[PDB]
Design a protein around this ligand. Structure first.
Ligand SMILES: *[C@H](C)[C@H]1/C(=C/c2[nH]c(/C=C3N=C(/C=C4\NC(=O)C(CC)=C4C)C(C)=C\3CCC(=O)O)c(CCC(=O)O)c2C)NC(=O)[C@@H]1C
Ligand SMILES: *[C@H](C)[C@H]1/C(=C/c2[nH]c(/C=C3N=C(/C=C4\NC(=O)C(CC)=C4C)C(C)=C\3CCC(=O)O)c(CCC(=O)O)c2C)NC(=O)[C@@H]1C
Ligand SMILES: *[C@H](C)[C@H]1/C(=C/c2[nH]c(/C=C3N=C(/C=C4\NC(=O)C(CC)=C4C)C(C)=C\3CCC(=O)O)c(CCC(=O)O)c2C)NC(=O)[C@@H]1C
Ligand SMILES: *[C@H](C)[C@H]1/C(=C/c2[nH]c(/C=C3N=C(/C=C4\NC(=O)C(CC)=C4C)C(C)=C\3CCC(=O)O)c(CCC(=O)O)c2C)NC(=O)[C@@H]1C
Ligand SMILES: *[C@H](C)[C@H]1/C(=C/c2[nH]c(/C=C3N=C(/C=C4\NC(=O)C(CC)=C4C)C(C)=C\3CCC(=O)O)c(CCC(=O)O)c2C)NC(=O)[C@@H]1C
Ligand SMILES: *[C@H](C)[C@H]1/C(=C/c2[nH]c(/C=C3N=C(/C=C4\NC(=O)C(CC)=C4C)C(C)=C\3CCC(=O)O)c(CCC(=O)O)c2C)NC(=O)[C@@H]1C
Lengths: 161, 48, 48, 160, 160, 161, 158, 160, 161, 161, 160, 159
């Protein structure tokens, strides 16, 4: 995938330019942010199960979806939906460490709309769930991390919608 | 105050702008002969 | 598989953006472990 | 980059990053500032490194700059030096990344095929990289040189 | 707060602040920004911390939420949770202050007497605080958790 | 007494509110100022004797007060006046570190006017001395510190007058 | 610093708090840097004393005058010896991280000792101030700030 | 520089450069490499030269660093040392130029007026420059020192 | 005016930087070129009259200019034109020794275009004469010197045009 | 130049009118102010060197300007700036005695902007210096004189800006 | 003039004049008196401006006044100068109007076609206008010159 | 067009450069300008009322509004008040401009012919314009009224 360090490198490589101070400064900026990111990632991993639970409670469950004839009705479908939620969370965590939204595009975002349409999964509900996870995540990670975390969640949401 | 804030953050404000019918529809100008009653107006008409 | 462009630059992301302001703003101040007489003589704008 | 590599391993396993893996990421970000300086040094000395290495290579291999040889002629000699410059740029990229992957994608995959079409001898190219390493090592401090050496060695290994 | 304590000692001695005392003030002001973040984290997670701790407490002590027990009934259960929330707010205040004094004045003096009149069991309250600590620790990073733990421990020590 | 940090806490506690960003900002403001204040306090402590000397020279001495029949005439009264000056200086320094004027009210300001009136100590002259100390202190502490130092000196002066 | 922390704990009759322990950890790390600062002043000691002495004598002609205490070779040497003593104490302070070492040797009973000697206390203070200025110049800015605190304390004490 | 001076004299006379003038230019270009080394030496030793000279100056003039004196106080003492550093930089420029003109424009014209507004004593400044000369002389070889001395002497002559 | 050595110094002075090896290298470069320049200057001075004669022969004379109604017609105008030619030569020689074009800008180039336009002197013809002088000078000075000499002549030409 | 008395005279002369009571009243007004002005002028002349020193300390020195690459860097430039400051002070004093701003326009203000722009002197910094001088002057002259003094200083500042 | 512009925009929108638009009209009427003076200055200097500009143009373009060229001959040269005079008159009209519209209707629409029939080179005409601008600027005060420049620039842009 | 442009155009046909006499006429306009701007703002704010009052004076309570009248039916009534608004807006434009030409170019041209085809009564329309003038005169105040009146009269004469 691509990360901030590699993104700078790639931009320079297409130009053919050797790395310069301005480029170095961007790299330096990333290095400082890194420590914060690692702490945030550890928080998310530990609380992943709860984050999903809370988000589902906020948006998915106690709804027509869970009621018979709904997309999340039946154990199989319910389990699938929470598995998808976990995917989104894991990838967002990866993106946050990376400092780049590209991984989301390469793995999660590509073909998702089409997959969902064939499946008949409701996109808007999924987006709702992602937004819910974001809110929960924001609390756990704390303020400095929150802003960074939010952008990746929003990126996923925009892609799906 | 709460009832006019977004429930969800809107963390990348640009995404939420430029949703809907695109702005082009509203931006464009209409041209008529009734406006033509001037030498410059007429030139705009014709270009249009 | 068609390769994908970049929607957002590294500098737009909040944590980087902040760190850039911190280095850029107050890039020039007072250096510790530098004798004051050398620091008073140092130039900020440099060229231009 | 180191971080990209860690993420990729996690994704294959379909798991969140391990604490140990996270710790390695932390170490890398701390190391980065030192790495940036090492890269900066080589960039400044780039022009001289290439020039010196070129001369050494031509002394080591008279044949390449001989009427038969590929390098012979002004145009050809320039191209050979341009190639050396390219490899140096790649090495700098590697040092900042902390991984050979950036180097590898741009320079080491399909290199054999490209040079075989050109008819350039691969071993000579390797010698040029070795020569560049020696020049670069001298300018670098010992510990810095060791770090730089690893990337240089990888290139030499790749072109074999 | 740290600063109040230092000033008070100086005033008693009728002297200007000692260098050592001044140094402690310096350390505290540096620590403050980190402290603020720790407090902020707990505030955001407050609702969940209380909820989780409550459940744990009720599992640990069935009796309190039983027809005989004080906590039993909706009104009473709400009050028990409100109390837990109060103690959490006090803990946050403590972390920013860097001292237990803020906590102590609001919550720990006369606590025994108040609860005895209410007939609330003090040990159960202590358990609830312990429960809150465990939840809070999980959300906090390790070093942050240790800092938060001290304040939580003090509360538990105060109430027995 | 109270300090800035505790003042914020107390205001929130009476409301029962958890600490909020606006409150956090006030706390953050204090934390930045803190380092400067500590440096200022050390300067004042070292130069305290001189500060008093200079201020007395500016207002108190070479005056009717020191001359026979004046309030500060006789060694005993002179010594008392300089002791009072020292008190004001020490308390102002305490207040500056604290970032709150309350300590001045609790210790110095309470009953001072009444005490002085019974004693027959002249309030306006005392105020003059406090203002003089402020000016001397301002120089030593330097500009950033001076603004902070000045408010506490002014607080004392206003109380007495 | 460690002694100070222990003493506060003993008064409270409690084990050292984690925060208190952390401060101890920071101090032990800082110590090596502190030793270097002290070493610098030790090497420059002879010159610091000499320069400070000259400044003091310029500031106070009286002390080195027939009436004055400092006047005469023997007396001037003793005045410089005193300045040297205070510098040694300052170095001890920097390594300790506390003024207590300085305080015990130099600042308690100082008034009484000098009054018997008849040496003027303000002049002594000026000499210490003078030494500070010389020392500050040789030290790097951050190092100087650390050293300044100890110098200021002495001036305050005297 | 030597060359500028020669051109200016020629232009005033409205003539092409005289043989004698040309010869002086030739001598200067030969001398230049030696001059560059002399300048390099002083640059490396700059920090110590300034420090040592400052101490000597303060010993020579107790008054300047006294409560009355301009130099007194840390801020002021730093500024005095900064001034000494400035003059040293100018001297190095002079040596490479082979003429005092570079020195003169930056430092010697309006110097009296500037210092009089500042109230700095001009003779003390001169002493500082003399002090710097002595330190610089010791590090330089004898012949090198003589060359450097001339520039140092000019400065002292300019400001007295 | 400025010279190469002073130009390096001035660049460093605005930065406030002490002279460094990179700067020294530029100075060293000048010093090597210096000896050649001195030899070239002596050649030009000795052959100055001839250089002007040859250049005039190449461009100015046997032309409409010299014929009646031409700018260089009449003895007075002819003499003026050759005087101007001499100026250009002398200044170019000065510039070559200096190693800097600045003197040309300060003395020769400044206001010349405007003067010539008011006078009705033809600029293109003057430029032609300068180029002719360059060619003659190139021969006498020899190849190494010629390259250096040429740049200053070209600078004059560009300024006028 | 013009002064208040002459300004009245000139206005009447163009009308051809003999002096009238209304005109006399304006003259009388000036005569009362005159005594104050004379005292102020003497104060300024005696303290001129100090006024300039203080104003420079307030704005010009310890700044980027004095640091290398700044306009007031180098002794020559520093001396020039303080010379300009003196000019402004002397002319303002002249204007205050005269009671008319015209002399400032005729001597100081005319062509100054253009001169400064060619020189690259920064106008805003100069204005800052003038304002600083005004503040220092205000103190020395005392309040009644200060009002009169201030208007001329402000006039200079407005002209430059 | 400006006011016409404002009215026209309002009529297109089919609305009464906006307050902001009205304010701009107010500003314009105040500015007009100053504008009249600027125009007056150029009118007085008109004869010299044209003459000077003509000479400059002919120097810049020898070809126009050559047997092939359009301007060649007394009759033709007079006409070329008359054209320059016309454009100057238009510029003055523009300054008082505060808009290029008066200039535009009389001089810039169909200009290409007219000159192409005449066979006059359009770029040369533009140079003449540029020349006139330079002369006019010198006589005008700086701020006045800037105002005048805009109108002159428009003409140059139009004939291009 | 405008007073300023009118002066310019008169000079342009003569080919004369701008002269002081011409400048004086322009100066005259510039003084009047400030008054005109104030008047225009008054009219814009009170436009709806002006039309209402004028209609009350002439158009309503009349045969026109009664069945078989030109202004009978909502559609026709609305058309008539729209026309009234046009006249008001253009008169305001003319007053600012200081020139009657705009009225000729937009409002006056072809109106008579249009009205005759429509069967709209010109005299009644003129009556309405005169009524608007009277109302406008009050609001603008006397100095402004004289200037305002001429444009209203010009419209009436054209119609
Ligand atoms: C009862 C013996 C146990 C119990 C049940 C319980 N369930 C919920 C909530 C839900 N349970 C389901 C289950 C199903 N959905 C399906 O499609 C199927 C198969 C057809 C099942 C069985 C779902 C979807 C929900 C979510 C709510 C919704 O329908 O939208 C709860 C409460 C939820 C909560 O935890 O808040 C409970 C209590 N709980 C016990 O402890 C009993 C042992
Ligand atoms: C309402 C439940 C949801 C909603 C509506 C919404 N629609 C638009 C825009 C368009 N609507 C249509 C749709 C149709 N055209 C058709 O012919 C048919 C079938 C007969 C339909 C349903 C079209 C073409 C447009 C775009 C063109 C237009 O608007 O004229 C918008 C955007 C409107 C805008 O101005 O941006 C919206 C908001 N959106 C919601 O959130 C509801 C869930
Ligand atoms: C003379 C032997 C020594 C000496 C004296 C000295 N005194 C002052 C200033 C003051 N002296 C006094 C002392 C008194 N005031 C009292 O009320 C009493 C008892 C009745 C005494 C003895 C005071 C009040 C002052 C302050 C100024 C004033 O008079 O109002 C000075 C000047 C101090 C200064 O630095 O300004 C001096 C010199 N000094 C010596 O060294 C002699 C040995
Ligand atoms: C040291 C030997 C003496 C001394 C120094 C001193 N200087 C100042 C202030 C200034 N010094 C300068 C000097 C220069 N500017 C230049 O451009 C150059 C040449 C390159 C020089 C030498 C300037 C401009 C200032 C003004 C402050 C500033 O830099 O912004 C001071 C303090 C000024 C004051 O107190 O007002 C001092 C102490 N003074 C002595 O007495 C020493 C003998
Ligand atoms: C004949 C008596 C002697 C002689 C003449 C000679 N002249 C030239 C060349 C030129 N002579 C002129 C002279 C003038 N130009 C003017 O405007 C005037 C005044 C109206 C004069 C007198 C010029 C301009 C030239 C240069 C060529 C040109 O016209 O453009 C030559 C040729 C020399 C050469 O190499 O160019 C000669 C031979 N020489 C003698 O020996 C006779 C005694
Ligand atoms: C010869 C190649 C061309 C030529 C020369 C020419 N020049 C003039 C007259 C003047 N030339 C100058 C030039 C300068 N004055 C300066 O101060 C400087 C720079 C500092 C220069 C280079 C000036 C000012 C004059 C006028 C007064 C004077 O000559 O001293 C003429 C005669 C013009 C006249 O009418 O007097 C001539 C012939 N003209 C050509 O046609 C050649 C191409």
């Amino acid at each position: 995938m691509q990360d901030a360090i590699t993104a700078v490198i790639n931009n320079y490589d297409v130009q053919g330019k050797y790395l310069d101070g301005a480029a170095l400064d961007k790299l330096k900026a990333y290095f400082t942010t890194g420590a914060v990111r690692v702490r945030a990632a550890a928080v998310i991993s530990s609380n992943a199960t709860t984050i999903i639970k809370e988000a589902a409670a906020k948006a998915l469950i106690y709804s027509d979806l869970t009621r018979p004839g709904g997309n999340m009705y039946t154990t199989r479908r319910y389990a699938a939906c929470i598995r998808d939620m976990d995917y989104f969370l894991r990838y967002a965590t990866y993106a946050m460490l990376a400092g780049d939204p590209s991984i989301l595009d390469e793995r999660v975002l590509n073909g998702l709309k089409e997959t969902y349409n064939s499946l008949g999964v409701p996109i808007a509900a999924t987006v709702g769930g992602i937004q819910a996870m974001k809110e929960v995540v924001g609390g756990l990670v704390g303020p400095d991390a929150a802003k960074e975390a939010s952008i990746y969640f929003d990126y996923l949401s925009s892609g799906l919608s | 105050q709460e009832l006019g804030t977004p429930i969800n953050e809107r963390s990348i404000p640009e995404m939420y702008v430029n949703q809907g019918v695109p702005a082009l529809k509203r931006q464009r100008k209409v041209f008529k002969q009734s406006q033509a009653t001037d030498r410059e107006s007429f030139d705009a008409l014709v270009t249009a | 598989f068609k390769p994908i462009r970049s929607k957002m630059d590294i500098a737009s992301m909040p944590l980087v953006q902040a760190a850039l302001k911190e280095q850029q703003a107050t890039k020039t101040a007072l250096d510790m472990s530098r004798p004051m007489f050398l620091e008073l003589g140092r130039s900020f704008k440099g060229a231009d | 980059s180191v971080l990209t590599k860690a993420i990729v391993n996690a994704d294959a396993e379909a798991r969140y990053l391990s604490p140990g893996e996270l710790d390695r990421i932390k170490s890398f970000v701390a190391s980065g500032e030192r790495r940036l300086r090492i890269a900066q040094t080589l960039t400044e000395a780039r022009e001289r490194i290439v020039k010196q290495a070129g001369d050494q290579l031509f002394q080591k291999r008279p044949d390449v700059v001989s009427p038969g040889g590929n390098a012979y002629g002004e145009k050809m000699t320039a191209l050979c030096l341009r190639d050396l410059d390219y490899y140096l740029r790649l090495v700098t990229y590697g040092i900042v990344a902390g991984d050979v992957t950036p180097i590898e994608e741009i320079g080491i995959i399909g290199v054999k095929e490209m040079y075989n079409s050109l008819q350039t001898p691969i071993p000579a190219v390797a010698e040029g990289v070795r020569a560049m390493k020696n020049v670069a090592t001298s300018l670098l401090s010992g510990d810095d040189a060791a770090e730089a050496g690893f990337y240089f060695d990888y290139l030499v290994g790749a072109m074999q």
